[PDB]
Structure 1
Amino acid sequence: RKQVSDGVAHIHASFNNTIVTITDRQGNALGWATAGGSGFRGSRKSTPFAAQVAAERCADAVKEYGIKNLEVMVKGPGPGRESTIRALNAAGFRITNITDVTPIPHXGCRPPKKRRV
């Protein structure tokens, strides 16, 4: 209920889904939306359009806080890397910063075995 006006949008763009979480600058979440939760399943859930719809829903969920400025942190290789940012800019927020925070081990743990399809 307290005004913030300075938030951070975290995009978790995986191959199967997009999770958009808007927090304040201290990392406390204010609202979230996901492509899977915005009425998309299966092959439709992992599209840029579903990610854009999720970004719009997250903006609507955080509308009460009166956020004006947004930093953006994108993590993952998923197809919803840029549609979410485009929707966030179209929703009226002022995109101040954009940063990639995809984790990269510096070697790290052994990955799962290759799939034989």
Structure 2
Amino acid sequence: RKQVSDGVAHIHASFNNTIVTITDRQGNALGWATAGGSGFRGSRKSTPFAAQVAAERCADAVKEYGIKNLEVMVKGPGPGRESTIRALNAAGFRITNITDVTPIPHNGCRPPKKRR
């Protein structure tokens, strides 16, 4: 429980799901909540609203660590990614800075061939 002050809020924002991992400055996790585990299932995981409910259900169950202010990292080009940080302005936090950690390779490995 550790009585931490500030945290780093990683938001993995893929197409089929958003998971929200609130950690500390150090980089080791304090609590996470996903858009799947909030009652939304299958296609309904892939909405911004499930990301908002995920950010709520993380922002409490990190209450016991006592975080006043947090940074926001967002990885992934998904349908959440903005409603989930409106849901961290509204959850009672002070947003220090917001970054983008979406991995853009200087094209390396080959992508899959997926669609027809």
TM-score normalised by the shorter chain: which range applies?
A: over 0.9
Distance in 2 separating the partners of 1:14 and 1:37: 15
Distance in 2 separating the partners of 1:41 and 1:24: 29
Question: Which SS does the other structure have where 1:45 is aligned?
Answer: helix
Normalised TM-score (structure 1): 0.97
Distance in 2 separating the partners of 1:13 and 1:60: 20
Task: Supply the RMSD in Å over aligned alpha carbons.
Answer: 0.7
Partner of 1:86: 86
CA deviation digits over 1:60-84, x for unaligned, max 9? 1101000000100000000111011
> Which 4+ runs in 1 deviate beyond 6 A?
none
Gaps of 5+ in 1: none
CA deviation digits over 1:22-65, x for unaligned, max 9? 00111010000000000001221110000000000000110100
The offset of 1:114, in angstroms, is 3.3
Distance in 1 separating the partners of 2:61 and 2:108: 37
Distance in 2 separating the partners of 1:107 and 1:50: 32
Distance in 2 separating the partners of 1:23 and 1:78: 21
* Identical-residue share of aligned pairs (%): 99
Gaps of 5+ in 2: none
The offset of 1:104, in angstroms, is 0.6
Question: Aligned pair count?
Answer: 116
Partner of 1:40: 40
The offset of 1:107, in angstroms, is 2.0
Distance in 2 separating the partners of 1:81 and 1:22: 14
Normalised TM-score (structure 2): 0.98
Distance in 1 separating the partners of 2:27 and 2:105: 23
Question: Which SS does the other structure have where 2:52 is aligned?
Answer: helix
The offset of 1:5, in angstroms, is 1.5
